[PDB]
Structures are given as structure tokens and as C-alpha cells.
Amino acid sequence: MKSKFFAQNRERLVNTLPDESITILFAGQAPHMSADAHYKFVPNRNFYYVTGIDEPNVIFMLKKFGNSVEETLFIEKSDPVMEKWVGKTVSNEEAEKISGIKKVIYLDSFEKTMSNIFFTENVKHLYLDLECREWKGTETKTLAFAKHVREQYPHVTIGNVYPNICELRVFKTDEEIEIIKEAIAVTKDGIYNVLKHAKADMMEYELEAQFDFTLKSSGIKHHAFNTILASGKNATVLHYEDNDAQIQNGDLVLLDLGAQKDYYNADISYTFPANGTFSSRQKQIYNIVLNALKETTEIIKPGLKFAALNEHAKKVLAEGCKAVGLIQEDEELSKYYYHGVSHFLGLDTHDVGTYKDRVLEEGMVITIEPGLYIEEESIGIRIEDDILVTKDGHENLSKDIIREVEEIEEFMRENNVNV
Amino acid sequence: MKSKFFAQNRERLVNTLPDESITILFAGQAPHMSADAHYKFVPNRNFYYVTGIDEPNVIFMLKKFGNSVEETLFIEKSDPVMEKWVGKTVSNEEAEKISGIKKVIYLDSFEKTMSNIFFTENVKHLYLDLECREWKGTETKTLAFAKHVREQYPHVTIGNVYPNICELRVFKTDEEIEIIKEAIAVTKDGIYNVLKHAKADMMEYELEAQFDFTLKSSGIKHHAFNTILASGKNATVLHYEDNDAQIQNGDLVLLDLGAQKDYYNADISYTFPANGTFSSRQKQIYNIVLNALKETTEIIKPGLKFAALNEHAKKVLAEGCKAVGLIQEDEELSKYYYHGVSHFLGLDTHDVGTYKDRVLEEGMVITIEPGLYIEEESIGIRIEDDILVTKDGHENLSKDIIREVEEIEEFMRENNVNV
Amino acid sequence: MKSKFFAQNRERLVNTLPDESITILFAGQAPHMSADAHYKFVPNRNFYYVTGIDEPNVIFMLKKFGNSVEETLFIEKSDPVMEKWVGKTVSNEEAEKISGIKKVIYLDSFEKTMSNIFFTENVKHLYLDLECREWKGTETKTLAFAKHVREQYPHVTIGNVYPNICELRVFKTDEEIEIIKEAIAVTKDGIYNVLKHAKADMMEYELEAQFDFTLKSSGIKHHAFNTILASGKNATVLHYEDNDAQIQNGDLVLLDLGAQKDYYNADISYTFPANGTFSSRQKQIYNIVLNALKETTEIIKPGLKFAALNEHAKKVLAEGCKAVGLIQEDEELSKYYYHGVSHFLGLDTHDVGTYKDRVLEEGMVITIEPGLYIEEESIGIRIEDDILVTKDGHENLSKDIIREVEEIEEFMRENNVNV
Amino acid sequence: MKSKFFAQNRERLVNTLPDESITILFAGQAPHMSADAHYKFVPNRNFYYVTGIDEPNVIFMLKKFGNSVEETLFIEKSDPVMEKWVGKTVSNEEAEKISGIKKVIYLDSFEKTMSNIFFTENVKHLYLDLECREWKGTETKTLAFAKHVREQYPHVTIGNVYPNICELRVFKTDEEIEIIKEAIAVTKDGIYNVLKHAKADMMEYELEAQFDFTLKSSGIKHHAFNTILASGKNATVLHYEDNDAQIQNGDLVLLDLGAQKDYYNADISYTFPANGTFSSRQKQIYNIVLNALKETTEIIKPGLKFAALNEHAKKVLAEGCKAVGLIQEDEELSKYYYHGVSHFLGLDTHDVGTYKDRVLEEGMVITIEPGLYIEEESIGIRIEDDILVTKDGHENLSKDIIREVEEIEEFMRENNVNV
Ligand SMILES: [Mn+2]
Ligand SMILES: [Mn+2]
Ligand SMILES: [Mn+2]
Ligand SMILES: [Mn+2]
Ligand SMILES: [Mn+2]
Numbered sequence A, B, C, D: 001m002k003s004k005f006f007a008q009n010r011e012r013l014v015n016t017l018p019d020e021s022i023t024i025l026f027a028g029q030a031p032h033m034s035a036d037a038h039y040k041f042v043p044n045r046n047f048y049y050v051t052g053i054d055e056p057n058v059i060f061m062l063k064k065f066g067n068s069v070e071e072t073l074f075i076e077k078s079d080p081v082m083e084k085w086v087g088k089t090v091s092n093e094e095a096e097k098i099s100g101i102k103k104v105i106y107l108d109s110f111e112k113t114m115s116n117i118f119f120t121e122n123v124k125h126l127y128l129d130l131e132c133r134e135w136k137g138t139e140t141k142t143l144a145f146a147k148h149v150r151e152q153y154p155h156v157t158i159g160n161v162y163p164n165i166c167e168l169r170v171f172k173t174d175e176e177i178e179i180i181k182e183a184i185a186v187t188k189d190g191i192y193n194v195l196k197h198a199k200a201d202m203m204e205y206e207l208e209a210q211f212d213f214t215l216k217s218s219g220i221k222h223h224a225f226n227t228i229l230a231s232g233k234n235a236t237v238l239h240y241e242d243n244d245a246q247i248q249n250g251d252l253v254l255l256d257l258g259a260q261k262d263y264y265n266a267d268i269s270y271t272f273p274a275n276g277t278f279s280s281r282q283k284q285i286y287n288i289v290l291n292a293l294k295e296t297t298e299i300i301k302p303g304l305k306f307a308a309l310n311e312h313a314k315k316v317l318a319e320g321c322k323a324v325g326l327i328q329e330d331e332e333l334s335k336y337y338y339h340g341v342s343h344f345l346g347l348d349t350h351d352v353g354t355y356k357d358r359v360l361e362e363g364m365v366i367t368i369e370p371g372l373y374i375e376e377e378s379i380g381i382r383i384e385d386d387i388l389v390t391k392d393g394h395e396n397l398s399k400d401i402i403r404e405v406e407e408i409e410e411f412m413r414e415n416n417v418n419v
């Protein structure tokens, strides 16, 4: 991932913003976890998308005046003492090389800069990234910053740049797609490794261990999200994360997981039989889902209404359910299939972007993940691919992952130590 | 960990609080990570220590009036929709069973309870757990709550119960020490597994993968802290976490890691030769550090001033450094050893409790971690044990971990595939 | 009053609001009175006019997006315990039937809806009913709400819908006029009852009781405002409410009062001799006022500047005063007549709507209430009618109430038990 | 009520407050009702009890320093314009005469007095009347005042004087009791008036009108609380206020109402048969309730725990219910009797004062109000007397009200036009 990518993102962002306005983005800090410990730092995707900087506590500013456009970074100064504890923070020159932003100055001059901007330069329009997902959320640095601006500069108009950046993230470039592909690749390897080691009478976490191992030893530092490794009746809980039950012989195992490469996410659901063999009933239910996957993936092309995806998924899932006698009428389905089939994928696993009235266009990456959940039969199945919308159709980024009942049983037979 | 342990914690806590006072503790929730994702929930250690409840969103209350003492829990009501996404939350009866608290009610009655406590019952003294580590920190649910109490009940005196509970956590019971013991035990297995798989020309993270595997397969859901796996020059950064450099032949490998069992933490530092053989120079520096370990461990017993540990450590390290020729005078040491030698250990890896004027006493668990860091030689060494203070001395909780140069070289010969 | 009425109110309201905006109205709750008691709940007239709902604590919401328009109500869930104290609150179905609003959901989902509205749907323009009559007023739930919106969604623009709804309330429909007519009708009955029971040497409140009785026994739950029942010198205080003096023989009695029907208000002032016979002097002053009432009512018609009413009232009052000898020049009138002659009438007694530059138009209901107040003679007289502005003139909604000196003396002779 | 009464109230209050402290009480103002209308002003009882001033917008201040004690009143200055609308506000001399407070100054000097108090005199301890009954209540003038003091004078300790005054109000003097007696007297007259006019096939409000009439024409300006006039099944809803149903022949009618004299409250519940005859079944239930009344009133005397009243009430209601076969065991009572039997009475209807661990003492006025409510039989009966606790027993303040079934049937036969 090279500076040119980020520079172009800024060009595009610039074109969405009014003239005579300033925009500020904050890298953020890792939140407190417990005692003196903090959580692992997670780069703010919008900030990162715009600056290419993956470190805390940097600040980015974009001034738009007349025909001019001025971008600036504020980084930390070096601290010889802290370097013996945590290593060196990004340097002036590194920051410029990475971000492609020419003007890189220090945080200690941010306050004075604020003073000039809002007084000397009579700026009237400020944009911040105002992501606020909860009505009763608690105050964040950003919101606090907005409150401050409101009090010192009550005449300044505040706008939200969040939506502006999200709508750009919706359309992936080729190098973005390449990284996702790599993430998927490693996820496949992880899954295959699970398939090669799975057996009955084995703890769910013993299997999770194998997936984690494959990712870790290939250099992947993070997962896309928390691994779902659910066997038997547990696969009925959508985001089951306990992963601490014993896998019974005859149990189906649902995997929902993904590696993360350079801050891009893969997202795969995969269901297989623990003992290497699908039961007659499991084979039925699995193929109904798998149909819904193929059918739904099929209709993907520019011009299609996003809402059509789940509509079709529900149609196909209902036909399969009837055929098999699980239900009589379409309405009963919500008892066995109670989520949406698709979501954007990118810098975030449930990537950003509006869905309302969304129409599919070239460049979008979305997931397709139909599933069926039968509590009384202790069967949970979900199968999920990551699809790229192309110029005149789609490309299945995760097609290399074998999905057919025959292919799975065969693979576990050749490769699984204890089958 | 059985409810009697938490009931007793509450009994001791009660004795530290004034009469005519109410205390409230909050379980909290997982902080925002990115987009719709949150971090993994980490039980608030104080809240956990007092209630034994490891779920979010619960509230605890302790009324102390006259001769009375009334404990209450507020839990979430069940939600048939969310149960299909995340599973059931603790039930009315389970909470009672776990915490030993008799009166358990629901959150939707918390507000009305507030109104009565502060109006009808004329309560004037409220205690909150006010952990505030940063002067320019951002507002938290608790601080917000205090603010609200200040505005609605200005006459109510607010006190901080944080210090009360930390001082209790300083003294571990037998059942506490048993869990720490288990945590160390797995850590050991982890380390051994690293020792048996290590070789030259191998990625740091490849070795981390092996440690992670051992823990995960044994059911351990979390680490104590972010594993440090630093080779050659990298061992010189105290909290080096990149774990993404190649291990050179002749390199030394510094491990600083620990498993966590039922929320209690192990914390071990271990240093070994990648190729299974210490070089002369390395053997020297190692033993110097080893000595400091045994020496400083030696003097541990109730009555000893905490400050004394680091004094002795510095003294013994300096002597080793002189004899070897690394330094001339004691003052130069700080160039090669620039941290404390000890810290409390417990529900937090850097456990709670004041250090100022601290004297050791039966019941404390602490670490001893002398090290030497020689930048110009690309040598970093740290050796760390978890010591328990007994009634007339100490007990080294991690004595089973082999430390001698001979023991290590011998072990890697017998067990390491590629030596 | 049927749902079509309110439905049309909302259609009109919609046409005054910009596109891409949301509007929220709160029913409110009764204010604290003393100890655990609250005042009688008074439906917020704007909220009522829009929803047709007379209960507390409901919330109304109107989204205007693209060509779409979505109306939603939030109501209280039923509570089997409270139903034993206060009775059932409006039900899901009743609310729909009354308001004509199809979507009716519960308050416990209001917060989540807020989150979605202001995050997911990127709403930028919010309208609230911001009636704020006092510069140093105290914070209200609505202002507290705006403050919250401002802190969480600093980019959101806040508009005031109060003016929008008031201007709609200014033009009454036929159904509205009818209700006003009913309210006036009862007021008449109440007045006649007073006339038939009045005598000298009687407590002002004794007469009040007779008027209250007529209204209550006729089903009327509330008065328009606080009954004014002023005898002798007391009629000189414009809003005299004590109502606790003894009516002297020879005293005139000024009645200012009005029944309220279905939340619409009547408003009538009526003066008469306690002993059933006007004195010469009283006949003079009464006729001066009655002249102003007729003359000022006479000029009412679409096109007329509202400011003209009081100009003419003054003119005519001064004419009567000159003729009788009370004053020499027009300027002296302010000593005897010191209020406006007219105000709007409707869901509020001093109904809403601007007066600056106002021109009369069909549909408006206004009052005409000239008076004279002569302190040194202990005479205070006011006669007030409720006028409807019609297509080409006016209609006196209270013409049935007899006003002539001879008509009153005669009525009291025939009907007053002690004359 | 003469000034000496309020003067003694302040003397007692003074003895409950620490030395070196200042106390401020606010008269308040009438809250906004609708548009330009405000609710009727209701003197804040604590303020009233301390000052004897029933006007709004006054401020009272008590300085306690060394051996000194300085009381001050701040009143409004006269406004010649407003006097023509609302009348004269309390004058400098009237204020002194009414309150017994010697130093009376004007509001326009309140602010400067605040400065001197909190700067020049170094006052550290401030008491306010901090009644706050709702955890999520809205900011009040007093809370805003507190907040202000907190911002300008952060060192100043704020205490709540509410409890202090409430405990004084709990013990009534002889002149207080007299007034309550008067309120009760009128209430009785009003009830009898209702008995004399009640018949079947008559609107509930038609009866309420009769009760209001008696009160109004006797000079009573306010009701204790909202008249409850519940017939048939409606008597089942404890605070039924609609009062708009038709009384069916055979219906029992439940009155719960009370006159207010000079701010003191009566509170009576009276049940009778609409047609003048108790049915067998009604006679049964009525007598059970009336027993509970006599029995519970009986045990009242200094030394008796307040909690005993309800315990005995339940005990005696159960016996009656068993005897009649309405229930089998005591537990079933909650189905038909679901409230407390007693509450303090005074300047408030549910008068102030703590109940927890309360022991009855001479001077206390409390109500006794057993009831039975049978939904399936459409029968709701409550009977309530106001009791005074005397030196060695109790005095029934409302004994003159006839309660026996024969007494009532007789009274209605004698006096009721239509029986
Ligand atoms: Mn997934
Ligand atoms: Mn997914
Ligand atoms: Mn360590
Ligand atoms: Mn350590
Ligand atoms: Mn009027």
C-alpha cells in the first residue's frame, strides 16, 4: 500500500467538501482496558484511509480556500526515554513518505494553529468525523473538541465528514482488492488446517487453536473479528463466542472467522462435519444453504438493488425448506433464518456505507452468507463468500475454498489424521 | 472460585467504609473498537473482585445503615431476540448462586431505586469506584454518573472506594494463589513448547504461534498481556511487541509472556539461545542476571521494605557488571538496567496497590525480574519469577521452570527437533 | 373531533417544513405541585393539535425525505400494577384510531430509533417545538433534549416548529368553531345562573360557586382560565382573582370567565348590578363600554388591520367619556382604559399567533373586550364577545348573551329569586 | 395563624442547624401551564412553614454565626403598572407583621448580598431546601442556584435543610390541628351534600359538582387533592379521577376527597350506596372495612411503631375476608387490598416525614384508610378518618362523620329528595 493511494483518496475527499472550509481528523488513542493496561491500538479506519498513518495521536488537517488546498500532519516529537520502552514513533520523514503529505509538523503547535485558523483566517466552516452510534453514548475526544469549538467560536458551522469518507470507502481500487484477496487466502489455509485436525470428542477451543496457529505463523497480527467456532446446538447462536464446549460425534461445526491483512478484512463462514461425514439430514440442510449462496451470488451485477440480495436469499431458502418439509409457507422461514444475507466488507468487517436505496456498482465488495438454524435438531449451518462487484457481473474472491459436500468429505479423508 | 470468596471480600470491604453510606459499582461494557465492532469485554477487576460477576452491564450496590448491611444486584432481563445472537445472559438464580448475594433485581428498576435512596432515605455519603489515571482523560460512565449525582443531589458527599478495594486485593487468599499457580503452570508448558520448536532463521511470530497454541489448546482464553518475543537487538526494547523480525543464528531470545486463568495472571520472563547454545559472552550476562534473581528473591519476607528489592537488585547487577568489565562504577548501571525489579501480581498483571512506603507482608504476590540490556552488543536478557510472601519468608511460585544454563542447553538438546 | 381533522393538520404542517428533515413533538408530563402531588395534566396544545392525543408522555415524530413522509407515535406500554391506581393508558389501537397515525410503537424503542435517525440515516435537520417565553426561564425537557442533540450530533441543524403550528392554529375550521360555540353556550348558562342568584350582602365566591356549579354539572371538566368575579372597587383590578370580598348593595359585578370544551376555550366578560338595578351613573359607564363593543365589533372583516380594532375602541371609549364628562381630551383615556381590546381565541384562551402587522382573514376567532375602570368611583366595567371572522364580515359567536341595560334588569326581575 | 407560630418554627429550625452556616429558602413561582398561562400558585410548604408568606418570588435567609442569628426577607418592590392587572404584592410592613421577621429588604439587593456573604464574610456552609424526588428530574431554580454556588464558590459546603423542616412539620401544634379540624368540618358538609343529592342514573361529575359547590360557597379556595368520585367498578382504581361514568342503580359510590383550609388539608374517604340502600353483599364488605378502620384506629398511641398500623389493618381485613368466604388464607388478601393504610397529614395531603422505623408520638396527625376492592364483583370500598395522636392515646378528628350502614341509609332516607 503506497502513498499514491492515500493522496488520491484526499483528492476525492476534497471534491466532496465545500470551499472555504477546514476539516480535521484525529488518529485517536487506545482506550483504557484495566489498571495501567490499554487495549491494542486500532487505527481509525477513516483517518487511516485518508492519511495512511497507522499510529496514535497524530492529527490531520485539510484547508480548502479559494483555489488552494493545504494538507498538514501533526506528529509527536521524539522522546528518548519512551523509545527504550515502546520503540520509536513515526518520524517527520517517514510520515511524509507514507502519507504523501508534504507538510509535517509537531503536535505542540496544534493549539497555536487552531488560534490562527479560527481568528486570523476567519474560517466559518469546520468538518469533523462525527461517528456517533449511540444516543446515550459517552463523550469522546472528538465530541469534546466539537463542544470546545462551539464555545470558543459559536459562529463557526460544524459539519460531519463521516459520510463523505464512508462513501469513498465503498468503492475499492485494485490494490485494495488485492489485499482482501491475501486475507482470504490465509483464511482458507486456516480453515483447511482446521479440517485437517478436526475429530469428535475435542474441545471447541482446541480447533480454534489450529486456526489461530495458521494465521499467526504466517505473519497475520490480527483477526477480522472474534472467531465463531460453534458445534452442534451452539451454531444456533449467531455470534456464539464462548468456543468452550465439547464437540460431540455427529456434530456439525460452524466456522465464522477471518484473517486481517494490513487492516483489510476477510470474512468467511464454513460448515463441516466433525467426524468427516455429513449425515443424511445434515447433507440436506447444508445443500439448501449452499444453493441460496450460489443463487444469490449469481444475480450480482451493477444495477441490482442491494435489497434484492436478501429478497432472493429468502426465496431460495424457503423453496429448499418446503422441499425438505421443514416448513409449509414462506412466512415460517423467519424461525430458521433471522439475519440479513449481505454486508459491505473492507477496512471494517461490517464495512461502512449506506444501504438504504443502495444500488450495486462496480468496485464494491460485499458478503453473501445465507444460513439455517434449527434449534430442535441442534443444527446450525452458515456458508459465506466475499464477492466483488465487477463491470458486468461479479467475482467470487473466495471461490478457491471448496464447498461441496463431496469435496469436503474427500478432503478430510485424504488429509485428516483421524479419519 | 466459590461465592464464599466474594461474600468475604464484601465483608472486609464493609469494614473499611463509614456508616450511613451507600456504595455503587458498575460492571461496565466493552468499549467501541471500530465501526459496529467492540473490543472483547474485560471484567472490571474491582467489580469482579466484589461480586464475582464477569458480565457487562450489571450494577452492584451496598447500603450501610445503622447495624444493617444490604447488598443488591441489578441484572439484565432476558431478551428472546438477543439470545439468538449472543446467548443467554446471567439469570436471576445464577447471579445469586455465583455472587452469594441474596437480593437480585433488574436494571429497569435502577432509576427508581436511585430516587428513593437519595430522596426518601436521605443518604448523604456515596462511594464510587473512581479510577482516574489521566488528568486530561475523557469522561467515563462513572464520572458522568458522579456528575449527575452532583447536579441532582448537591449535598451528597462523594467518596472514592477504589483505594479501599485495591488494598484488599493486595492480600491474596489460598484459593487465589491456586489459580495463579495454574496460570503459571500453563505458561511453563507454553515456554517449554517454544524451547522445543525454536531454531535459527525463523520468524519471531512463528515462535509466538507455538506459545499461543499451547495456551489455547489448554482452554486458556486470554493472555495476561501482549506477548513479548524479542530476539537479538530487539530484546533491548522493554515492551517490544512487533514480534516480526527474523531470528538470527547466535541470537538470544527473550520471552516475556503469561497466561491468564479465571482472570488471574501469570507473568514470566525467560531468555534462551535460539540455536540451543549460549555463547561465552551470553553465558556471562545471563548468569549475572540470574544471580540478581536468586539474590533478590532470597531477601523476601514480611517486614522487608518494598523499596529494598530494587536496591538489592541494582547492587547485585552492578557487582556482576563490574566483575565482567561492563562497568567501572555503580552509576553507569542505569545505562544497562532502567526499570524496577518488582511489581504486584494478581487480577491485573501490574496489580493494584500503593507502593510508597510499602512493607512486605504475608499474602502478597510480587514479581522479580532483573534484566540487562546492552544495545551495542545486541544482547537483551530478563529473567522473571512470581514470588508469594509467606508468614516467615517466601515461596517461589514458578520454581519448576528450569533456569540454569546447563538445564536449558540440556533440555533443548533432548527435546528440540533441530539441534 | 375525529382523526381526519388532525390528519389534515399534519398535511398542512408538512407543507411548511423543508425536505430532508425530521420533527419531534413531546406530549409532556404534569408539573410537580407539592410533595408527591402533581398539577392536573394540561395537554400541550401544539402536540394535541397535531396528534389528537391528550395523554402525557407520548411522543410524535415526522420524517420528511425525498417524496416520502413517515408519521410515527411512541406510547407507553401497559403496566398491570399502575392500572390499579390510575387506570389504563391509551392502547396501541386506540391511539391509531384517534390520531389517524398508522404506525404506533412504544417508548422503550425511542432511544434506538434516535440512534438510527441521527447516525444511519444521516439526518441533518431537526425541528422541535421550542416555545421559550422567558429569557431566564429554567431548563425544560425539550431544551434539555436540544442540548443533548447538540452534544451528540453537533452537525445537526435545529429548527423551531412552534411558529409553524401556531400560524395554522390561527385559522379555525368549522368543527373547531362548533366546539367554541358549545363552550360559549355553557358559559351563557353559567352566567344566567349567576344573574338569577345574585343579591347584595353576599360573598363574591358564593356567586363563583353558582357559575362553577353550572359548568361542572354540565360535564365541563375545566375552565378556560381563573374565574374573575369582581365587585365594586375590585373590578378595577384587571385580573382580580381573590374573589373573596363582600358584594355591597349598589355594587356592580364584573364577570370575566369561560368554560372550556374539548380543549377549546370560551372567553366572556359580563357586568351587571348586584341588586338588579343599574344606578344612573352605572348606566352611563356601562353604555359607553357597550358602545365601544358594538362599534369595534362592527368593523371586523377580512382585510382589516388587527391594530385598527384597538384604535377604534379607544376612539369610541373616549367619545363616550367626553360626552359624559369623564374626560376632556383623548389623552386622558389611558387613566381609565389600559389594555388591548382584542386577542385570538382557540385551544388557548389567549390563543397563539403573531399580532405584528396582522391582517384579519376568514377563519380567525378573536375577542372584543373594551372596558372602563374608574378607581375613585369604585366602578369597573368590561363586556367581551367572541367574534368569528367570516368571508365578508364577522359572526358574533356570543350574540345570544343579552347585553342591554333593560334586558338585564328585566331578566333579573323575572328570574332572580330575591328582587 | 399568627406570626408567633412561624417565629417559633424558625427557633426550632435554628437549633437543628450547625453554627457558622447560612440557609436560603425560595418562595418560588407558578410553573408554566400553556401559552401565556401559568398554573395557580401553590406556596412551597417548607417556605411557608418557615416564613408564613404565601406570595411567590420572596426569598428567606438565615445567618447563624457565633451567638448571633439573623433572619432576613427579600420581597418584590411595588410596580404601579402590574398593580392594575394583578393587585398589590405584599408590602414592607405587611411582610414584617405576617412573618414576625424584623429585617425586610428588596430582591434587587439579593445579588450584592450574595457577594458579601460568600466573599467578605467567608461563609463556608450553605443549606438549601433540596427536595428532589426524581433521579431523572429536570433542573429547578434551586438546583440551578446550587450549581451556581458550586461554580463561583467551589469551597462552600452545601447541605440539605429539607429533612430538618420535614421533621418539624411532623409534630402539629394546637392551632394547626384546629385548622385541619375546620377543613374536615367543611369536607363533612360537602359529603353530606353529596349524600342528599345522589341517585341512580346520574353522571359521576354531577355528584362532584355538589361537593365542589359546598366547598366553594363556604369560602374554601382549594381542594386537598383531585376529587375521586368512583362508582361501581371504577372504585377499583385507587386514584380514579375521570369522574365521567354513569352511576348505575345498585352501584356503590366511593368518595375520596377533601377541603383545604389555609393550606392545611383534610382527607376523607367515604363510601355509600347510590340508591340509598346497601345490598346484602355490599353491607358485608363495607362492615369488614369499617371494622378494620375501628380496630386500627383503636391501637393508636405514643410508643406504637408506625409499621404496626398496616400489619393490624391487614390482619383484620383478612379475618373479615375469611369469615365472608372471600379468601381462604391471609396471602390472598393482596388481591383485594393493595396499599398502605396510613399516611401523615398536614400542609401536604400525603404530608412530609420519614416512615422507616417511625414510632408514633403526641402531636402527629395520620390517616387511616382500609379498603377492599373486588374487580369481579365491581365493588370498591374505602373508609378513611384523620387521626390525631394525643398524650396517652388518639383523637378521631373526623368522628362526627356518620359511618354505620344504618346511619347512612337513615340519613339518605331523611334527606335525599329521591328515595
Ligand atoms: Mn461472517
Ligand atoms: Mn459476515
Ligand atoms: Mn514480565
Ligand atoms: Mn513483570
Ligand atoms: Mn375575558
Ligand SMILES: [Mn+2]
Residues within 6 Å of the ligand: C267, C343, C367, C369, C384
Ligand atoms: Mn379576554
Ligand SMILES: [Mn+2]
Residues within 6 Å of the ligand: D256, D257, D267, D268, D269, D369, D384
Ligand atoms: Mn384519601
Ligand SMILES: [Mn+2]
Residues within 6 Å of the ligand: D267, D343, D367, D369, D384
Ligand atoms: Mn389518604
